[PDB]
Amino acid sequence: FLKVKNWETDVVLTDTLHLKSTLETGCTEHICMGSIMLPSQHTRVATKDQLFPLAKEFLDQYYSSIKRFGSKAHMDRLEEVNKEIESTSTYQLKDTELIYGAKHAWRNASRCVGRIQWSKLQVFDARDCTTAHGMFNYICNHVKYATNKGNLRSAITIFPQRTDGKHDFRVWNSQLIRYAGYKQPDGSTLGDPANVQFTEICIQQGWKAPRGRFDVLPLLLQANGNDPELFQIPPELVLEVPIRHPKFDWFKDLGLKWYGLPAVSNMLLEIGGLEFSACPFSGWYMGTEIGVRDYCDNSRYNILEEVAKKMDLDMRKTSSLWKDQALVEINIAVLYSFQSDKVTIVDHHSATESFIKHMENEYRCRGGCPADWVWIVPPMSGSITPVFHQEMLNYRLTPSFEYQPDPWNTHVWK
Amino acid sequence: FLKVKNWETDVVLTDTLHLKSTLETGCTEHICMGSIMLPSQHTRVATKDQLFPLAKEFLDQYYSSIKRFGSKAHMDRLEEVNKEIESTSTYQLKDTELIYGAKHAWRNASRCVGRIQWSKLQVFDARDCTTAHGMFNYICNHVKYATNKGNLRSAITIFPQRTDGKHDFRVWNSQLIRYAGYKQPDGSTLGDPANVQFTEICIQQGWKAPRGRFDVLPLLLQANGNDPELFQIPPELVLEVPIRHPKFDWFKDLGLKWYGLPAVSNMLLEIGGLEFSACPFSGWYMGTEIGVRDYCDNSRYNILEEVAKKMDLDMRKTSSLWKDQALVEINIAVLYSFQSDKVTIVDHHSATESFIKHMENEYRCRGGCPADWVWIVPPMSGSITPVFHQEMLNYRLTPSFEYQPDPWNTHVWK
Ligand code: HEM
Ligand code: HEM
Ligand SMILES: Cc1cc(N)nc(COc2cc(CCN3CCC(F)(F)CC3)cc(F)c2F)c1
Ligand SMILES: Cc1cc(N)nc(COc2cc(CCN3CCC(F)(F)CC3)cc(F)c2F)c1
Ligand SMILES: C[C@H](O)[C@H](O)[C@H]1CNc2nc(N)[nH]c(=O)c2N1
Ligand SMILES: C[C@H](O)[C@H](O)[C@H]1CNc2nc(N)[nH]c(=O)c2N1
Ligand SMILES: [Zn+2]
């Protein structure tokens, strides 16, 4: 029955939810790994013996959720899934169980600061898909729906679950919409340095690169274990925000833009012991993901250089904080630009207030809320936001989103 | 033999030092508490049975450190301390062992970002002190020495070790130099809201408050378990920096200042199982401790209000980032002000680069370096500093600094 404190409001919450926790963290009584990026407990073959405990555990919380725990409908479904796991050594979720499962994987994502919206998620069942073309079609409808004219809406599309392991559905893009990255002759990088290897893989399978800055990458969709195929998202579906500043008329000359829809595509959805290796999900951007990390990480676009130049800043000395000063302007501009185009965006102050509010509700009507402080605190202005001052307990609950190896290091090619 | 990665330079280090680790963290295989502020494993009665293992373990690393491990001088000292722990059920450190012990408590402080200087620490042996007046004198000499005309120098003063427990030396101030805090009639707070209870305790024992903003508090020194006594540091020894900005000539009108010397006084030094309940230590300020936390925490001085006002900022909307913009100017000003007075200060960029450099040396010539990411990353501009991108392993090594309860909740009064 552990306690967590906010050292800004002296507010205390009591966590009993962590008792239901199952998976492991990486920490021991003698070491803490709370700052390892992809621990071996966050990354993803299962057998029939292990499946029914996982399925029972999931069914028991789903039926306890619709206020019919242990009734006839529960007991028969428990038996029904038992039977099918004898027969096929696996099983299929009901539509209702897939929606519940998917929504609580988000709910349980301890590194997600936006979880106040977890119950307002739109679940697209693509488990009848058999071809890369079918996936491309499902994904396009996802983009259209979730974008909704800049009035962004949360959604997820779920392709068929892993079976044997060699008949796996995978999106090879880490995100549905990303900008290309090309190395140069002098070694420097055009576009996005993160994607330079993926941009090469696309050109290896036959992409024709418009070798520039903000070139939207094509999709690489692998269906039922087959070699993945390239498809270009119709440009009218890729909504983009040109970045301007409310003071500096040279900010337009900087010539930056960004896509509206953050849609993570490379991770694994786990529901009652079933593994969904392709489950792209989308919401809306918190400003700092673009303005701080995307734009200003050294190994990303790295624009602190030029923004400070045009501001005419004391750049000889490290302690003039010219880096800090150009970082705040970049985030004022990303925010402003999205908002003047009616495209949904949230500032790190509003989003962190909501998560504290959300934490309140979770400890009250659920007995806790797993939270990863290292990831919740925004990458700028940490301590002028309320999450910096909030103790958080991190633990792993299922249903969950998990990391998985990149397919090009696993795919038995041809 | 665990591995930690920097996800900015792709640099990898290997940690074997954590195998020598002894104390516990608070985390388990099923929960991570890396964001609990004062876990029960960081806070501090010991007996004679437990003492010799602790003493042997300390002696073995001290003698392995001067390149005479297990020699005659080691074996006799091992025996010599054994004998004295039979006799007195405790023991005394040699001057050399006290210096080594003290320096490695800093070295092992995983929440300290400044540890690159750990070997350049000046150890003042005050274990012959018997009176609160003696403590006051030792502390004044500490302040003078460590301040060194603004050319600050690291130092620590070590009063006699705990014995029975009721004859304990304690400094009641959380820091040697702090500003007073007074509540108002309307409930608001003048000075520093952190110290309002301590400021009351001083007035309870008889302080005469010059009820203003930056009033340096008196010392409250408890000697050998006796009721603590008040002493005022000679003002000529308390060096202070008036805060101005290199652009805004209304920054002087803001009327802020800060003391030069950060000197933490309320914690416990543990060396070979001996407990030093009074061990004030000092270095120099990283800028963000004043400009971000001291000045801009909601429950501290909370000046983001007025700094943004005088900048004439868009303060109606949360997403104008006026808070962020006024925070960078405040830290440019604290830095600038200290530097124009030849008072030692370090910016969060320089200090975090040094710690990565320091981490390099520690993994190479020591096999690791315990580090608390939650505390190392600075409270502003997190990800434009290299520590944000560095995985760190946190574990507890001894000698160490530990938290301890405040004395006014423990002291059997009179
Ligand atoms: C609705 C608006 C949303 C916002 C503002 C938001 C915000 C964020 C942010 C800032 C991160 C940190 C990631 C990074 O810095 O790279 C994150 C991580 C994450 N979010 Fe959310 N997100 C939203 C929607 C969603 C949805 C719809 C899902 C799933 C259905 C989701 C699940 C996750 C997961 C799994 C992570 C990563 C955890 C990990 O790395 O293990 N989020 N989110
Ligand atoms: C030399 C310049 C130094 C700098 C720049 C520095 C910087 C810092 C900073 C920024 C923190 C975070 C504390 C906070 O945010 O409130 C910290 C914590 C700490 N430092 Fe250092 N420090 C220095 C010297 C020292 C010395 C001389 C000692 C001991 C001999 C020391 C031991 C510690 C300890 C024990 C902590 C707190 C760990 C905890 O909370 O458990 N530091 N330091
Ligand atoms: C739906 C959604 C909304 C939003 N507003 N934002 C996001 C971004 O969510 C994720 C972001 C990442 C990034 C992984 N990480 C990037 C930085 C690095 F490359 F350095 C290391 C790997 C992984 C995930 F699983 C995520 F859900 C997602
Ligand atoms: C020598 C030195 C140099 C420097 N440059 N800086 C410091 C500040 O070091 C410490 C600071 C603290 C603060 C404790 N913490 C304050 C914020 C809070 F009140 F919210 C919770 C408690 C505890 C310690 F043990 C420290 F060594 C020390
Ligand atoms: C080393 C560290 O774990 C790594 O840089 C993490 C820190 N916290 C983060 N937090 C978020 N939201 N996103 C990130 O990529 C990271 N990176
Ligand atoms: C809740 C959280 O543990 C707490 O606010 C911590 C976060 N990290 C910190 N880091 C430093 N350097 N100083 C602090 O006071 C804190 N506070
Ligand atoms: Zn941990």
Short mmCIF file of N, CA, C and O in Angstrom, two decimals, chain B residues 328-384:
data_model
loop_
_atom_site.label_atom_id
_atom_site.label_comp_id
_atom_site.label_asym_id
_atom_site.label_seq_id
_atom_site.Cartn_x
_atom_site.Cartn_y
_atom_site.Cartn_z
N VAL B 328 14.40 31.65 -18.82
CA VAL B 328 15.74 31.72 -19.42
C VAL B 328 16.43 33.04 -19.07
O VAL B 328 17.63 33.06 -18.76
N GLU B 329 15.69 34.16 -19.07
CA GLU B 329 16.29 35.45 -18.71
C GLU B 329 16.77 35.48 -17.26
O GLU B 329 17.79 36.10 -16.94
N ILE B 330 16.01 34.84 -16.36
CA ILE B 330 16.40 34.82 -14.96
C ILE B 330 17.71 34.08 -14.78
O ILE B 330 18.57 34.49 -13.98
N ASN B 331 17.91 33.00 -15.53
CA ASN B 331 19.15 32.25 -15.41
C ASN B 331 20.31 32.91 -16.16
O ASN B 331 21.47 32.72 -15.78
N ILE B 332 20.04 33.68 -17.22
CA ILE B 332 21.12 34.45 -17.84
C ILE B 332 21.64 35.49 -16.87
O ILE B 332 22.84 35.80 -16.85
N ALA B 333 20.76 36.02 -16.02
CA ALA B 333 21.06 37.10 -15.10
C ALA B 333 21.81 36.61 -13.86
O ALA B 333 22.74 37.27 -13.39
N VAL B 334 21.38 35.47 -13.30
CA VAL B 334 22.09 34.92 -12.15
C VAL B 334 23.53 34.60 -12.53
O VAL B 334 24.48 35.01 -11.84
N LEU B 335 23.70 33.88 -13.63
CA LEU B 335 25.03 33.57 -14.16
C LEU B 335 25.86 34.84 -14.33
O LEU B 335 26.91 35.00 -13.70
N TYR B 336 25.38 35.75 -15.19
CA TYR B 336 26.09 37.00 -15.45
C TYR B 336 26.47 37.72 -14.16
O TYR B 336 27.61 38.18 -14.01
N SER B 337 25.53 37.83 -13.22
CA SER B 337 25.78 38.60 -12.00
C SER B 337 26.91 37.99 -11.17
O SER B 337 27.80 38.71 -10.71
N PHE B 338 26.87 36.67 -10.96
CA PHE B 338 27.95 36.01 -10.22
C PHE B 338 29.30 36.21 -10.90
O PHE B 338 30.29 36.55 -10.25
N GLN B 339 29.34 36.01 -12.23
CA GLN B 339 30.60 36.07 -12.96
C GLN B 339 31.21 37.47 -12.97
O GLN B 339 32.43 37.61 -12.98
N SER B 340 30.37 38.51 -13.01
CA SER B 340 30.92 39.86 -12.99
C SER B 340 31.44 40.26 -11.61
O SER B 340 32.00 41.36 -11.46
N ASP B 341 31.26 39.40 -10.60
CA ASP B 341 31.77 39.60 -9.26
C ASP B 341 32.85 38.59 -8.89
O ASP B 341 33.17 38.45 -7.71
N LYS B 342 33.39 37.86 -9.87
CA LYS B 342 34.45 36.86 -9.65
C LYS B 342 34.04 35.79 -8.64
O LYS B 342 34.90 35.23 -7.95
N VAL B 343 32.75 35.52 -8.53
CA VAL B 343 32.22 34.49 -7.63
C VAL B 343 31.94 33.24 -8.45
O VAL B 343 31.30 33.30 -9.51
N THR B 344 32.41 32.10 -7.96
CA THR B 344 32.41 30.89 -8.75
C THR B 344 30.98 30.41 -9.00
O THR B 344 30.19 30.24 -8.06
N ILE B 345 30.65 30.18 -10.26
CA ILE B 345 29.36 29.62 -10.64
C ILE B 345 29.58 28.84 -11.93
O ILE B 345 30.54 29.09 -12.67
N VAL B 346 28.69 27.88 -12.20
CA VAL B 346 28.78 27.01 -13.36
C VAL B 346 27.40 26.89 -14.00
O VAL B 346 26.38 26.80 -13.30
N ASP B 347 27.34 26.95 -15.33
CA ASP B 347 26.08 26.87 -16.04
C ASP B 347 25.71 25.41 -16.24
O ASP B 347 26.58 24.53 -16.24
N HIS B 348 24.41 25.13 -16.40
CA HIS B 348 23.96 23.74 -16.50
C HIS B 348 24.55 23.02 -17.71
O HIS B 348 24.62 21.79 -17.72
N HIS B 349 24.96 23.77 -18.74
CA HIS B 349 25.60 23.15 -19.90
C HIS B 349 27.02 22.72 -19.58
O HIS B 349 27.42 21.59 -19.86
N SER B 350 27.81 23.62 -18.99
CA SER B 350 29.17 23.24 -18.65
C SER B 350 29.19 22.13 -17.60
O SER B 350 30.00 21.20 -17.69
N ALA B 351 28.31 22.21 -16.61
CA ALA B 351 28.33 21.23 -15.53
C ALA B 351 27.90 19.85 -16.02
O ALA B 351 28.42 18.83 -15.55
N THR B 352 26.95 19.79 -16.95
CA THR B 352 26.55 18.47 -17.44
C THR B 352 27.57 17.89 -18.40
O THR B 352 27.76 16.67 -18.42
N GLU B 353 28.28 18.72 -19.17
CA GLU B 353 29.37 18.18 -19.98
C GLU B 353 30.44 17.57 -19.09
O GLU B 353 30.94 16.48 -19.37
N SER B 354 30.78 18.26 -18.00
CA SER B 354 31.82 17.76 -17.10
C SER B 354 31.44 16.42 -16.49
O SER B 354 32.29 15.54 -16.32
N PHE B 355 30.15 16.24 -16.17
CA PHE B 355 29.73 15.00 -15.53
C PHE B 355 29.81 13.82 -16.49
O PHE B 355 30.12 12.70 -16.08
N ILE B 356 29.51 14.05 -17.77
CA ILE B 356 29.71 13.00 -18.77
C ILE B 356 31.19 12.66 -18.87
O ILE B 356 31.58 11.48 -18.83
N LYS B 357 32.04 13.68 -19.02
CA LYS B 357 33.49 13.49 -18.92
C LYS B 357 33.85 12.74 -17.64
O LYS B 357 34.63 11.78 -17.68
N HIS B 358 33.26 13.14 -16.51
CA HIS B 358 33.56 12.48 -15.24
C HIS B 358 33.07 11.05 -15.25
O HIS B 358 33.75 10.15 -14.74
N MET B 359 31.89 10.81 -15.83
CA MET B 359 31.38 9.45 -15.95
C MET B 359 32.36 8.59 -16.74
O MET B 359 32.59 7.43 -16.40
N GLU B 360 32.93 9.15 -17.81
CA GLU B 360 33.92 8.44 -18.61
C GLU B 360 35.06 7.94 -17.74
O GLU B 360 35.42 6.76 -17.76
N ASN B 361 35.65 8.84 -16.96
CA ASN B 361 36.79 8.49 -16.11
C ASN B 361 36.41 7.46 -15.07
O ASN B 361 37.19 6.56 -14.75
N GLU B 362 35.20 7.56 -14.52
CA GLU B 362 34.79 6.65 -13.47
C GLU B 362 34.57 5.24 -14.00
O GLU B 362 34.93 4.26 -13.34
N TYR B 363 33.99 5.10 -15.20
CA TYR B 363 33.81 3.75 -15.75
C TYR B 363 35.14 3.12 -16.15
O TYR B 363 35.27 1.89 -16.15
N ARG B 364 36.15 3.94 -16.46
CA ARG B 364 37.43 3.44 -16.93
C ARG B 364 38.36 3.06 -15.77
O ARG B 364 38.89 1.94 -15.74
N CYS B 365 38.56 3.97 -14.82
CA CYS B 365 39.47 3.75 -13.69
C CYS B 365 38.75 3.30 -12.43
O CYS B 365 39.34 3.35 -11.35
N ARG B 366 37.48 2.88 -12.53
CA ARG B 366 36.75 2.45 -11.35
C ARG B 366 35.69 1.41 -11.69
O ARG B 366 35.18 0.72 -10.79
N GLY B 367 35.34 1.29 -12.97
CA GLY B 367 34.39 0.30 -13.41
C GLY B 367 32.93 0.69 -13.29
O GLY B 367 32.06 -0.19 -13.32
N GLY B 368 32.64 1.97 -13.15
CA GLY B 368 31.27 2.42 -13.03
C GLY B 368 31.22 3.81 -12.42
O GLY B 368 32.24 4.44 -12.20
N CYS B 369 29.99 4.26 -12.18
CA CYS B 369 29.70 5.54 -11.54
C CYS B 369 28.21 5.59 -11.24
O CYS B 369 27.39 5.77 -12.16
N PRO B 370 27.80 5.41 -9.99
CA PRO B 370 26.37 5.49 -9.66
C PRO B 370 25.82 6.86 -10.03
O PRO B 370 26.44 7.89 -9.74
N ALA B 371 24.66 6.87 -10.67
CA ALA B 371 24.11 8.15 -11.11
C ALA B 371 22.59 8.09 -11.09
O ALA B 371 21.98 7.12 -11.55
N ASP B 372 21.98 9.16 -10.56
CA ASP B 372 20.53 9.27 -10.45
C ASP B 372 20.05 10.26 -11.53
O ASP B 372 20.07 11.47 -11.33
N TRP B 373 19.65 9.71 -12.68
CA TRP B 373 19.15 10.52 -13.80
C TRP B 373 18.11 11.54 -13.36
O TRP B 373 18.09 12.68 -13.86
N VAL B 374 17.20 11.14 -12.47
CA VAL B 374 16.10 12.03 -12.08
C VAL B 374 16.65 13.32 -11.51
O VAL B 374 16.05 14.39 -11.70
N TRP B 375 17.81 13.25 -10.84
CA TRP B 375 18.48 14.39 -10.19
C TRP B 375 19.59 15.02 -11.02
O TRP B 375 19.82 16.22 -10.90
N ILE B 376 20.26 14.26 -11.87
CA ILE B 376 21.36 14.80 -12.67
C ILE B 376 20.83 15.75 -13.74
O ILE B 376 21.44 16.79 -14.00
N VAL B 377 19.73 15.41 -14.41
CA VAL B 377 19.29 16.29 -15.50
C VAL B 377 18.85 17.63 -14.91
O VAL B 377 18.12 17.66 -13.90
N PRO B 378 19.28 18.77 -15.47
CA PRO B 378 18.96 20.07 -14.87
C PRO B 378 17.49 20.39 -15.03
O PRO B 378 16.82 19.87 -15.94
N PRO B 379 16.94 21.25 -14.18
CA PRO B 379 15.50 21.51 -14.16
C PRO B 379 14.98 22.43 -15.27
O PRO B 379 13.84 22.88 -15.18
N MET B 380 15.80 22.75 -16.27
CA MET B 380 15.39 23.49 -17.46
C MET B 380 16.22 22.96 -18.62
O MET B 380 17.31 22.42 -18.40
N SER B 381 15.69 23.06 -19.84
CA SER B 381 16.43 22.71 -21.06
C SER B 381 16.99 21.29 -21.02
O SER B 381 18.05 21.03 -21.60
N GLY B 382 16.32 20.38 -20.32
CA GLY B 382 16.80 19.02 -20.14
C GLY B 382 17.54 18.39 -21.31
O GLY B 382 18.72 18.02 -21.18
N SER B 383 16.91 18.35 -22.48
CA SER B 383 17.41 17.54 -23.59
C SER B 383 18.42 18.25 -24.49
O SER B 383 18.99 17.61 -25.38
N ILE B 384 18.66 19.56 -24.31
CA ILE B 384 19.79 20.19 -24.98
C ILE B 384 21.07 20.08 -24.16
O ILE B 384 22.07 20.72 -24.51
#
